[PDB]
């Protein structure tokens, strides 16, 4: 309920940023994607692992 | 002036015990424990003979870490020319090794041995407080290699704060290699352990092959020759800390002198006044040819054209041992008239450094008595091709998705390999964007 | 009656101070034993100005010196007078220097400068009264710039009504162990221009330039270099330590030489350029050996006789010669210059002929004065800054400890203000 | 919506036997291996149900 | 919405539970390492989500 | 005190957004560096006000 | 100083008769029956001639009560190589042997003679007023073992008051013995003999086996050579009350500066500048290598790394025979550097004790004319590895449950074993966790235990 609403709310809180610049920040942007998806899945499995 | 070195991989332990044997032979640290020059048992700690610790009743041990999952390597080390004075309580090894790959030793089977060597690192870190980085010996595919380092550098940069360190990456040679997937472990090691580093320099075994078979006219490509040459080179590097002279600056001074950027990170170690029993007999040593023979292509660890190789820095190391007078004469005889092609918008100040108190040459090796050292630690922005060739071979072998199935079920995904390709392409294209001379 | 302290710093400032008190005790000869070698018994006050009281007529400096590399001071403690120092200077550790500006400025120095300020506070009151601070400070090392800047700051919030004497070695492209020194310069005199009273642009590559080219000396070493600079600043401060009839006092020097109190960078030159090596051994008469007083290419600053705007001069002699030839020489060299005829500087006639017995010579000819060539010294400092900073190079070494970019931005704003004000003065 | 899917993954958690002290030292290694294999597949299914439902 | 965003990051901060200090010092060190991992990741994502709102 | 801690974050958002990021030199990039470090210290204060107040 | 000497078990009685005949050859007690030096019968009445006083029949007999229910050890102390020099009638035999079973002694097999040993200790405790404690020769499981020492200690702490209880708790080598159950009694030792005691020591057997098989090279890996060397260590510790003079560093300040805490109760011993009978050919008499090989594992009874064990106290002891000014001359030899890792709240200096009068040398063994000694005895946290080894042995045995039904149907309890485990854990954590420098309680913000 509120748990899955939280998880999908954090999923939609990770938007794909605009591609612009001389490709410096894009690698940091990919790293931010992969990491933050990893701990949102971690929060999901912890929340559904207690229950 | 105190530092404790760790060594992983089979070739890492090989270069480690070779270099430590050279250290103990050139400081007079005998297998009797004591050094006979004074009356302190085990070793000493005065200013520069400071590779020891008061473990027993003045007993001093050559503090280092020898780690490999394959267990027979420490046994064949311990029956070597320095037999019983290695540590009988920290030679930690596993039972079955990863056997020439990356993923198993890093993710799956090393996960119950990382904490054991971490506890050993903590127990040796409760000892004397001298700390000037680290000295990590590893390769790309020799023993465990990348599997330990790819985890322990992250563990060092998270657990031990933001402390400086230094590592040794043995760049492979496919003519004497033992694997085929070396592009994969090379690209993985290069995106992992270099972004969590403070200092490093890569030594190429094919460069040793070139300077032996093409510059010294010897006919023996065996790892014992490589171990002795690495012992000589790393001994010349460490001799600034090991012996005090005119400009006896620390390794912290070197690493706060060299590195300009997190990405622009690597030097071109220029030391080829190549010597053996052949090229040391009845020759004459001068400060002109050994210094003029530096920028040429057949003297380098990584291949580069001299005009196409742009020196962001041109740092130098001298073993000295006679005078600083001839070094400060060669600063005008050689170093002052250097209008060689350089990097734009950066200072053009050549650096020299002389360290007295001679490290004794290798006993029972091949080279005769030699004096000078031209260990000119420059750097080259055009070493982007030296990894772009591996990226090209990795492109031509990676579109076929070869050896992927051994690197799927151990935790990672294809996004990791895409990220490794992205990281090396980013490093290279950053060198042709701003590293190679731009506007 | 008149007391000056002895605080030193740096890894090069300490050794130039060692040579400094060696060569200014060369004409004094104060023994470290206790046999009471009196230089001149009428000069009890003028030994008490620098060598302060510790026992009955045993006069020692306010000897406190600090650095984290003890090898240099342990080397110079075995000098000629290297042991006449109180057992209170040894306030130090073994943390290392490493040419690290942040550890002297921010991290390591903040735990050790408290002991230095405590010892100078408990040593300042142990006399009649306090008059002057002095410091041999350098920029060739890393730690020295930072801890000297913070020491000047702490003496600003702790002793505001006291002068401080700040020798400052300018960076060099000709002799340099490391090259980050543009960053060691652009954020060192960023606040030094509004923290101290008077400063010195003793250069290093103009100093090596006059050591190599216009002297032809085969000694490119720190030894003869320190000999020359110690002799020059000895001839400078001989006026302040020997007040015969003139050579006005501490704030009095700041009163008559400092308009717009940021423009306090006077350039200490010296006329005869006597050096260990090639030597000239005639009695230095006034006119044809004081002809090296006005030439701008013969001093410790990159200058120009026509592209130069002086607004103060000073000349403190040591021989027992006349003053009519000095006055006519001054009249010629002050009426010759067309660009010197500005709306400012009505009178700078301060010149001394005091009978002071020298060390190896019998007289002297010293120059102390401001100019606008310190602007072109800061201009080449700025072009080294543009060589190092426009791609943010090498900033990862220093930003990890306590710094950021906006301190450098306000430093560049102050540099732009200095350049604009000095260009306004040049076209005034 | 997937509150029954997280109960399904908690049943995959409930498919875990004890690590068997009454288990031969070769055999509960096999239990651990089929464990890590099945949560490799479960992690693939988890990023499936994370990425697919977000559209 | 800011209300739901900070209340929900507070709710997942409640998913940073008090530990289980039972065990030896090595088990407590492993617990400490897990704590450093979770604190590092969770405050990094807290500041990242704050920056995605404004900061 | 929870509604206080959410309405103030609302007022750190509301009353001062970043000023108009157009200045008549490259010094507007410098003041945007000021404001990104300003949002760094807003990150700092926002992790103070939830962890040192209600934690 | 007239402390009561108790000796039970086979090791206790063995080293009791051995060490008391070493006192006999030390104090000159000839097999005639009396000394030829001082003509007072039995023993003297000096400051050091105080172990031997008037209790028996006017003859100042050696003072040690010898009780053990194993009858063969009482027979071979009654029929060994000395028949009258001990107590002529006060040694009472034991009727039925425990036969390597400890748990019978505390509950079943040793309860008939507890009244007799109480009568003996009431006889020998109403004696002369000097009584600084008890010279207990503790054993674990050889004869009765820890049984009589345990019951004596508990009823001596609840009935005689708060007298000191100086123990020699031998932790023997399993190689030379034959029992396997020994961890059970060695961990019940903490419950029944450790809390109600007041001071203790340690003697060992593994290092003597190691040097006798490898270093000293004596072909005698039995209890006899162990007795021959533990006799030397017992003579060395009793030389404080036995050699009175200018430097009589006796037990009085010794018991003060040994133990700091309740459960820092266990000291360590490092006496090994030994010269053998096959080294007894006028070799080097060294005062330098006996200082240079201190923290090496040769002198250590248990192989532990000094690199990890912090010391809250250090009691140096160099007993020589040459010069009382050699005390100062050896102060100015090696003590200046000594950069040894310490707890941040303990002193640094080293005490000095010498006995400059030369002793009388024990014949017929594996020792030369030994005159000088080194012993760095102290309480070290480096015995945590040894107690972790013992606890690993006990955890493996309790997982194997060996002789559990042997050791439960006599008066023990599984909850009693749990409380013994908690007592052993308390003795662990006063050396494992609390014993190390606990400076991490000042303050920091990282996520630690606030």
PDB file of N, CA, C and O in Angstrom, chain G residues 112-166:
ATOM      1  N   UNK G 112      35.700 -37.886  52.509  1.00  0.00           N
ATOM      2  CA  UNK G 112      36.000 -38.502  53.795  1.00  0.00           C
ATOM      3  C   UNK G 112      37.194 -37.865  54.493  1.00  0.00           C
ATOM      4  O   UNK G 112      37.309 -37.977  55.719  1.00  0.00           O
ATOM      5  N   UNK G 113      38.078 -37.206  53.748  1.00  0.00           N
ATOM      6  CA  UNK G 113      39.322 -36.668  54.286  1.00  0.00           C
ATOM      7  C   UNK G 113      39.279 -35.139  54.356  1.00  0.00           C
ATOM      8  O   UNK G 113      40.278 -34.501  54.713  1.00  0.00           O
ATOM      9  N   UNK G 114      38.129 -34.530  54.050  1.00  0.00           N
ATOM     10  CA  UNK G 114      38.020 -33.081  54.193  1.00  0.00           C
ATOM     11  C   UNK G 114      38.071 -32.679  55.665  1.00  0.00           C
ATOM     12  O   UNK G 114      38.670 -31.654  56.012  1.00  0.00           O
ATOM     13  N   UNK G 115      37.502 -33.496  56.558  1.00  0.00           N
ATOM     14  CA  UNK G 115      37.603 -33.217  57.986  1.00  0.00           C
ATOM     15  C   UNK G 115      39.040 -33.369  58.470  1.00  0.00           C
ATOM     16  O   UNK G 115      39.505 -32.587  59.307  1.00  0.00           O
ATOM     17  N   UNK G 116      39.762 -34.354  57.934  1.00  0.00           N
ATOM     18  CA  UNK G 116      41.156 -34.550  58.318  1.00  0.00           C
ATOM     19  C   UNK G 116      42.037 -33.399  57.841  1.00  0.00           C
ATOM     20  O   UNK G 116      42.911 -32.937  58.583  1.00  0.00           O
ATOM     21  N   UNK G 117      41.821 -32.910  56.618  1.00  0.00           N
ATOM     22  CA  UNK G 117      42.640 -31.789  56.163  1.00  0.00           C
ATOM     23  C   UNK G 117      42.224 -30.492  56.857  1.00  0.00           C
ATOM     24  O   UNK G 117      43.056 -29.593  57.034  1.00  0.00           O
ATOM     25  N   UNK G 118      40.965 -30.380  57.298  1.00  0.00           N
ATOM     26  CA  UNK G 118      40.584 -29.245  58.136  1.00  0.00           C
ATOM     27  C   UNK G 118      41.272 -29.308  59.495  1.00  0.00           C
ATOM     28  O   UNK G 118      41.696 -28.276  60.027  1.00  0.00           O
ATOM     29  N   UNK G 119      41.394 -30.509  60.068  1.00  0.00           N
ATOM     30  CA  UNK G 119      42.149 -30.667  61.308  1.00  0.00           C
ATOM     31  C   UNK G 119      43.621 -30.322  61.109  1.00  0.00           C
ATOM     32  O   UNK G 119      44.234 -29.673  61.966  1.00  0.00           O
ATOM     33  N   UNK G 120      44.198 -30.738  59.978  1.00  0.00           N
ATOM     34  CA  UNK G 120      45.599 -30.427  59.696  1.00  0.00           C
ATOM     35  C   UNK G 120      45.815 -28.929  59.511  1.00  0.00           C
ATOM     36  O   UNK G 120      46.806 -28.376  60.004  1.00  0.00           O
ATOM     37  N   UNK G 121      44.897 -28.246  58.824  1.00  0.00           N
ATOM     38  CA  UNK G 121      45.064 -26.809  58.625  1.00  0.00           C
ATOM     39  C   UNK G 121      44.729 -26.018  59.887  1.00  0.00           C
ATOM     40  O   UNK G 121      45.257 -24.916  60.071  1.00  0.00           O
ATOM     41  N   UNK G 122      43.902 -26.557  60.789  1.00  0.00           N
ATOM     42  CA  UNK G 122      43.723 -25.916  62.085  1.00  0.00           C
ATOM     43  C   UNK G 122      44.937 -26.129  62.980  1.00  0.00           C
ATOM     44  O   UNK G 122      45.261 -25.263  63.801  1.00  0.00           O
ATOM     45  N   UNK G 123      45.608 -27.275  62.837  1.00  0.00           N
ATOM     46  CA  UNK G 123      46.878 -27.501  63.518  1.00  0.00           C
ATOM     47  C   UNK G 123      47.944 -26.532  63.024  1.00  0.00           C
ATOM     48  O   UNK G 123      48.669 -25.924  63.821  1.00  0.00           O
ATOM     49  N   UNK G 124      48.056 -26.380  61.707  1.00  0.00           N
ATOM     50  CA  UNK G 124      49.128 -25.608  61.097  1.00  0.00           C
ATOM     51  C   UNK G 124      48.747 -24.147  60.860  1.00  0.00           C
ATOM     52  O   UNK G 124      49.540 -23.395  60.286  1.00  0.00           O
ATOM     53  N   UNK G 125      47.563 -23.725  61.309  1.00  0.00           N
ATOM     54  CA  UNK G 125      47.130 -22.345  61.168  1.00  0.00           C
ATOM     55  C   UNK G 125      47.037 -21.597  62.487  1.00  0.00           C
ATOM     56  O   UNK G 125      46.912 -20.368  62.470  1.00  0.00           O
ATOM     57  N   UNK G 126      47.095 -22.292  63.623  1.00  0.00           N
ATOM     58  CA  UNK G 126      47.221 -21.662  64.928  1.00  0.00           C
ATOM     59  C   UNK G 126      48.677 -21.506  65.346  1.00  0.00           C
ATOM     60  O   UNK G 126      48.961 -21.266  66.525  1.00  0.00           O
ATOM     61  N   UNK G 127      49.600 -21.631  64.393  1.00  0.00           N
ATOM     62  CA  UNK G 127      51.036 -21.547  64.622  1.00  0.00           C
ATOM     63  C   UNK G 127      51.491 -20.097  64.717  1.00  0.00           C
ATOM     64  O   UNK G 127      50.678 -19.210  65.001  1.00  0.00           O
ATOM     65  N   UNK G 128      52.798 -19.874  64.540  1.00  0.00           N
ATOM     66  CA  UNK G 128      53.419 -18.560  64.694  1.00  0.00           C
ATOM     67  C   UNK G 128      52.724 -17.494  63.848  1.00  0.00           C
ATOM     68  O   UNK G 128      52.147 -17.778  62.795  1.00  0.00           O
ATOM     69  N   UNK G 129      52.789 -16.249  64.335  1.00  0.00           N
ATOM     70  CA  UNK G 129      51.921 -15.176  63.856  1.00  0.00           C
ATOM     71  C   UNK G 129      52.196 -14.768  62.415  1.00  0.00           C
ATOM     72  O   UNK G 129      51.318 -14.175  61.778  1.00  0.00           O
ATOM     73  N   UNK G 130      53.382 -15.054  61.889  1.00  0.00           N
ATOM     74  CA  UNK G 130      53.666 -14.732  60.506  1.00  0.00           C
ATOM     75  C   UNK G 130      52.915 -15.627  59.544  1.00  0.00           C
ATOM     76  O   UNK G 130      53.211 -16.818  59.436  1.00  0.00           O
ATOM     77  N   UNK G 131      51.923 -15.071  58.849  1.00  0.00           N
ATOM     78  CA  UNK G 131      51.163 -15.819  57.847  1.00  0.00           C
ATOM     79  C   UNK G 131      50.691 -14.804  56.811  1.00  0.00           C
ATOM     80  O   UNK G 131      49.663 -14.147  56.999  1.00  0.00           O
ATOM     81  N   UNK G 132      51.456 -14.665  55.731  1.00  0.00           N
ATOM     82  CA  UNK G 132      51.101 -13.756  54.650  1.00  0.00           C
ATOM     83  C   UNK G 132      50.180 -14.392  53.621  1.00  0.00           C
ATOM     84  O   UNK G 132      49.691 -13.686  52.732  1.00  0.00           O
ATOM     85  N   UNK G 133      49.935 -15.697  53.714  1.00  0.00           N
ATOM     86  CA  UNK G 133      49.055 -16.357  52.773  1.00  0.00           C
ATOM     87  C   UNK G 133      49.222 -17.860  52.705  1.00  0.00           C
ATOM     88  O   UNK G 133      49.399 -18.523  53.732  1.00  0.00           O
ATOM     89  N   UNK G 134      49.169 -18.405  51.493  1.00  0.00           N
ATOM     90  CA  UNK G 134      49.180 -19.846  51.282  1.00  0.00           C
ATOM     91  C   UNK G 134      50.027 -20.165  50.061  1.00  0.00           C
ATOM     92  O   UNK G 134      49.814 -19.587  48.993  1.00  0.00           O
ATOM     93  N   UNK G 135      50.980 -21.084  50.216  1.00  0.00           N
ATOM     94  CA  UNK G 135      51.802 -21.541  49.096  1.00  0.00           C
ATOM     95  C   UNK G 135      51.128 -22.761  48.476  1.00  0.00           C
ATOM     96  O   UNK G 135      51.539 -23.908  48.664  1.00  0.00           O
ATOM     97  N   UNK G 136      50.068 -22.498  47.719  1.00  0.00           N
ATOM     98  CA  UNK G 136      49.250 -23.562  47.148  1.00  0.00           C
ATOM     99  C   UNK G 136      49.931 -24.120  45.905  1.00  0.00           C
ATOM    100  O   UNK G 136      50.296 -23.371  44.990  1.00  0.00           O
ATOM    101  N   UNK G 137      50.100 -25.445  45.867  1.00  0.00           N
ATOM    102  CA  UNK G 137      50.611 -26.142  44.689  1.00  0.00           C
ATOM    103  C   UNK G 137      49.419 -26.793  43.990  1.00  0.00           C
ATOM    104  O   UNK G 137      49.117 -27.972  44.170  1.00  0.00           O
ATOM    105  N   UNK G 138      48.732 -25.992  43.181  1.00  0.00           N
ATOM    106  CA  UNK G 138      47.496 -26.425  42.544  1.00  0.00           C
ATOM    107  C   UNK G 138      47.770 -27.375  41.380  1.00  0.00           C
ATOM    108  O   UNK G 138      48.780 -27.264  40.682  1.00  0.00           O
ATOM    109  N   UNK G 139      46.858 -28.330  41.189  1.00  0.00           N
ATOM    110  CA  UNK G 139      46.839 -29.190  40.013  1.00  0.00           C
ATOM    111  C   UNK G 139      45.406 -29.282  39.505  1.00  0.00           C
ATOM    112  O   UNK G 139      44.450 -28.954  40.214  1.00  0.00           O
ATOM    113  N   UNK G 140      45.255 -29.738  38.261  1.00  0.00           N
ATOM    114  CA  UNK G 140      43.924 -29.871  37.670  1.00  0.00           C
ATOM    115  C   UNK G 140      43.310 -31.257  37.856  1.00  0.00           C
ATOM    116  O   UNK G 140      42.240 -31.391  38.461  1.00  0.00           O
ATOM    117  N   UNK G 141      43.953 -32.291  37.323  1.00  0.00           N
ATOM    118  CA  UNK G 141      43.282 -33.573  37.253  1.00  0.00           C
ATOM    119  C   UNK G 141      44.130 -34.817  37.413  1.00  0.00           C
ATOM    120  O   UNK G 141      43.642 -35.920  37.159  1.00  0.00           O
ATOM    121  N   UNK G 142      45.385 -34.669  37.830  1.00  0.00           N
ATOM    122  CA  UNK G 142      46.276 -35.809  37.931  1.00  0.00           C
ATOM    123  C   UNK G 142      45.880 -36.813  38.994  1.00  0.00           C
ATOM    124  O   UNK G 142      45.496 -37.944  38.681  1.00  0.00           O
ATOM    125  N   UNK G 143      45.975 -36.412  40.259  1.00  0.00           N
ATOM    126  CA  UNK G 143      45.474 -37.226  41.348  1.00  0.00           C
ATOM    127  C   UNK G 143      44.043 -36.851  41.661  1.00  0.00           C
ATOM    128  O   UNK G 143      43.153 -37.033  40.823  1.00  0.00           O
ATOM    129  N   UNK G 144      43.799 -36.340  42.871  1.00  0.00           N
ATOM    130  CA  UNK G 144      42.534 -35.661  43.130  1.00  0.00           C
ATOM    131  C   UNK G 144      42.415 -34.410  42.269  1.00  0.00           C
ATOM    132  O   UNK G 144      41.354 -34.140  41.690  1.00  0.00           O
ATOM    133  N   UNK G 145      43.503 -33.653  42.145  1.00  0.00           N
ATOM    134  CA  UNK G 145      43.553 -32.522  41.241  1.00  0.00           C
ATOM    135  C   UNK G 145      43.020 -31.232  41.825  1.00  0.00           C
ATOM    136  O   UNK G 145      43.518 -30.750  42.847  1.00  0.00           O
ATOM    137  N   UNK G 146      42.007 -30.657  41.179  1.00  0.00           N
ATOM    138  CA  UNK G 146      41.409 -29.415  41.646  1.00  0.00           C
ATOM    139  C   UNK G 146      40.409 -29.620  42.772  1.00  0.00           C
ATOM    140  O   UNK G 146      39.887 -28.630  43.291  1.00  0.00           O
ATOM    141  N   UNK G 147      40.128 -30.863  43.161  1.00  0.00           N
ATOM    142  CA  UNK G 147      39.136 -31.142  44.181  1.00  0.00           C
ATOM    143  C   UNK G 147      39.474 -30.611  45.560  1.00  0.00           C
ATOM    144  O   UNK G 147      38.715 -29.815  46.127  1.00  0.00           O
ATOM    145  N   UNK G 148      40.614 -31.042  46.108  1.00  0.00           N
ATOM    146  CA  UNK G 148      40.988 -30.604  47.448  1.00  0.00           C
ATOM    147  C   UNK G 148      41.407 -29.143  47.487  1.00  0.00           C
ATOM    148  O   UNK G 148      41.088 -28.450  48.456  1.00  0.00           O
ATOM    149  N   UNK G 149      42.089 -28.655  46.448  1.00  0.00           N
ATOM    150  CA  UNK G 149      42.377 -27.226  46.369  1.00  0.00           C
ATOM    151  C   UNK G 149      41.094 -26.412  46.294  1.00  0.00           C
ATOM    152  O   UNK G 149      40.987 -25.351  46.916  1.00  0.00           O
ATOM    153  N   UNK G 150      40.091 -26.921  45.577  1.00  0.00           N
ATOM    154  CA  UNK G 150      38.828 -26.209  45.423  1.00  0.00           C
ATOM    155  C   UNK G 150      38.058 -26.141  46.734  1.00  0.00           C
ATOM    156  O   UNK G 150      37.592 -25.066  47.135  1.00  0.00           O
ATOM    157  N   UNK G 151      37.915 -27.282  47.416  1.00  0.00           N
ATOM    158  CA  UNK G 151      37.177 -27.284  48.676  1.00  0.00           C
ATOM    159  C   UNK G 151      37.937 -26.519  49.754  1.00  0.00           C
ATOM    160  O   UNK G 151      37.326 -25.797  50.556  1.00  0.00           O
ATOM    161  N   UNK G 152      39.271 -26.629  49.757  1.00  0.00           N
ATOM    162  CA  UNK G 152      40.089 -25.869  50.693  1.00  0.00           C
ATOM    163  C   UNK G 152      39.950 -24.374  50.455  1.00  0.00           C
ATOM    164  O   UNK G 152      39.795 -23.609  51.408  1.00  0.00           O
ATOM    165  N   UNK G 153      39.955 -23.947  49.189  1.00  0.00           N
ATOM    166  CA  UNK G 153      39.831 -22.526  48.882  1.00  0.00           C
ATOM    167  C   UNK G 153      38.450 -21.992  49.234  1.00  0.00           C
ATOM    168  O   UNK G 153      38.335 -20.897  49.799  1.00  0.00           O
ATOM    169  N   UNK G 154      37.389 -22.751  48.935  1.00  0.00           N
ATOM    170  CA  UNK G 154      36.051 -22.238  49.217  1.00  0.00           C
ATOM    171  C   UNK G 154      35.778 -22.185  50.719  1.00  0.00           C
ATOM    172  O   UNK G 154      35.269 -21.174  51.220  1.00  0.00           O
ATOM    173  N   UNK G 155      36.161 -23.224  51.474  1.00  0.00           N
ATOM    174  CA  UNK G 155      35.927 -23.166  52.910  1.00  0.00           C
ATOM    175  C   UNK G 155      36.951 -22.296  53.627  1.00  0.00           C
ATOM    176  O   UNK G 155      36.689 -21.853  54.748  1.00  0.00           O
ATOM    177  N   UNK G 156      38.085 -22.003  52.987  1.00  0.00           N
ATOM    178  CA  UNK G 156      39.071 -21.078  53.516  1.00  0.00           C
ATOM    179  C   UNK G 156      38.688 -19.631  53.246  1.00  0.00           C
ATOM    180  O   UNK G 156      39.145 -18.734  53.963  1.00  0.00           O
ATOM    181  N   UNK G 157      37.867 -19.390  52.225  1.00  0.00           N
ATOM    182  CA  UNK G 157      37.336 -18.060  51.970  1.00  0.00           C
ATOM    183  C   UNK G 157      36.041 -17.788  52.722  1.00  0.00           C
ATOM    184  O   UNK G 157      35.759 -16.629  53.043  1.00  0.00           O
ATOM    185  N   UNK G 158      35.245 -18.821  53.015  1.00  0.00           N
ATOM    186  CA  UNK G 158      34.012 -18.620  53.773  1.00  0.00           C
ATOM    187  C   UNK G 158      34.162 -18.977  55.247  1.00  0.00           C
ATOM    188  O   UNK G 158      33.214 -18.774  56.019  1.00  0.00           O
ATOM    189  N   UNK G 159      35.314 -19.489  55.666  1.00  0.00           N
ATOM    190  CA  UNK G 159      35.477 -19.875  57.064  1.00  0.00           C
ATOM    191  C   UNK G 159      36.694 -19.232  57.715  1.00  0.00           C
ATOM    192  O   UNK G 159      36.614 -18.816  58.874  1.00  0.00           O
ATOM    193  N   UNK G 160      37.816 -19.129  57.002  1.00  0.00           N
ATOM    194  CA  UNK G 160      39.017 -18.519  57.556  1.00  0.00           C
ATOM    195  C   UNK G 160      39.107 -17.020  57.304  1.00  0.00           C
ATOM    196  O   UNK G 160      39.988 -16.366  57.875  1.00  0.00           O
ATOM    197  N   UNK G 161      38.238 -16.463  56.474  1.00  0.00           N
ATOM    198  CA  UNK G 161      38.222 -15.031  56.230  1.00  0.00           C
ATOM    199  C   UNK G 161      38.762 -14.683  54.848  1.00  0.00           C
ATOM    200  O   UNK G 161      38.389 -15.303  53.852  1.00  0.00           O
ATOM    201  N   UNK G 162      39.641 -13.682  54.794  1.00  0.00           N
ATOM    202  CA  UNK G 162      40.094 -13.072  53.545  1.00  0.00           C
ATOM    203  C   UNK G 162      41.615 -13.103  53.447  1.00  0.00           C
ATOM    204  O   UNK G 162      42.265 -12.104  53.132  1.00  0.00           O
ATOM    205  N   UNK G 163      42.204 -14.262  53.721  1.00  0.00           N
ATOM    206  CA  UNK G 163      43.643 -14.426  53.580  1.00  0.00           C
ATOM    207  C   UNK G 163      44.011 -14.635  52.115  1.00  0.00           C
ATOM    208  O   UNK G 163      43.202 -15.112  51.313  1.00  0.00           O
ATOM    209  N   UNK G 164      45.242 -14.265  51.768  1.00  0.00           N
ATOM    210  CA  UNK G 164      45.708 -14.426  50.398  1.00  0.00           C
ATOM    211  C   UNK G 164      45.916 -15.902  50.066  1.00  0.00           C
ATOM    212  O   UNK G 164      46.237 -16.722  50.931  1.00  0.00           O
ATOM    213  N   UNK G 165      45.727 -16.232  48.790  1.00  0.00           N
ATOM    214  CA  UNK G 165      45.557 -17.605  48.315  1.00  0.00           C
ATOM    215  C   UNK G 165      46.473 -17.883  47.131  1.00  0.00           C
ATOM    216  O   UNK G 165      46.019 -18.325  46.073  1.00  0.00           O
ATOM    217  N   UNK G 166      47.770 -17.598  47.293  1.00  0.00           N
ATOM    218  CA  UNK G 166      48.753 -17.686  46.211  1.00  0.00           C
ATOM    219  C   UNK G 166      48.797 -19.084  45.595  1.00  0.00           C
ATOM    220  O   UNK G 166      49.116 -20.065  46.273  1.00  0.00           O
TER     221      UNK G 166
END
